[PDB]
A paper describes a structure:
The blue form of [name] reached its maximum at 5.7 h and completely transformed into the red form that had a maturation half-time of 15 h.
In the crystal, [name] has one protein chain per asymmetric unit, and a contact analysis revealed that the protein is a monomer at pH > 5.5, i.e., in a highly fluorescent red state. The structure of [name] demonstrates a clear electron density for a cis-isomer of the red 2-(iminomethyl)-4- (4-hydroxybenzylidene)-imidazol-5-one chromophore with coplanar geometry of imidazolic and phenolic rings. The chromophore is stabilized by four direct hydrogen bonds (H-bonds) to R72, W95, R97, and S148, and five water-mediated H-bonds to S66, Q111, T113, E146, and L204. Compared to the mRuby structure, the A222S mutation in [name] resulted in the formation of two additional H-bonds of S222 with H202 and E220 (corresponding to E222 in the alignment, and E222 in EGFP). Therefore, the introduction into [name] of the negatively charged D130 and positively charged R229 with a large side chain instead of N130 (N125 in eqFP611) and L229 (L224 in eqfp611), respectively, must stabilize the monomeric state and perturb potential AC and AD interfaces. In addition, based on the crystal structure data, the chromophore in [name] lacks any signs of degradation and has a single cis-configuration stabilized by the N148S mutation.
Author numbering: 8 to 67, 71 to 227
Amino acid sequence: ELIKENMRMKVVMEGSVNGHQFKCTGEGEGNPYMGTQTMRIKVIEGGPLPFAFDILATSFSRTFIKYPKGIPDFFKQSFPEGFTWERVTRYEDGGVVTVMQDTSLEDGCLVYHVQVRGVDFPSNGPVMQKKTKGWEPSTEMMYPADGGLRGYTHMALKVDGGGHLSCSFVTTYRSKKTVGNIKMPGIHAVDHRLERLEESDNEMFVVLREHSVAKFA
Ligand SMILES: [Mg+2]
Ligand SMILES: [Mg+2]
Ligand SMILES: [Mg+2]
């Protein structure tokens, strides 16, 4: 079918955080049925970023979730047309990030277009001071919502000196399927582990790896 055991992805991300304009490109691959993927990301405009790359990392891939056959896979069913996602992220101490994403399939490659707008991060907070240490593993609750899905995640951004910055994601996943059917899942959870590795000194190059597995709520 269209989502093969090996799939490539490409991403273009444009946005701003606290007025700082940037652009990133990414490419990678994974095993959509095993829920594993890796991607290589470059900051191509606005680099070096004067904020933590961690606030972008969660915007770089829902086709690579391991769904058990008993839980319908909204994302893989949405091809060939694909799906969109819209997110609002609220950070402890201020920091609101709004994200709009398109997922398409072009010549057998997944193609992502992402728009990111971050505002009101404190000037001497760990995001704008680049004192973050990556994301804890998290569980995203998935709910049926008017023929799409609502995702809800409480994430913990690790900070220098042992603390965390609490943050909350509400995501709306919408199908772009204009011909054909989608079997809607019930309430479920997705367990995520997002790792950054192979980073350059000023985060102009970052490798992300993700493990995403669906389970019953
Ligand atoms: Mg399915
Ligand atoms: Mg902060
Ligand atoms: Mg660098």
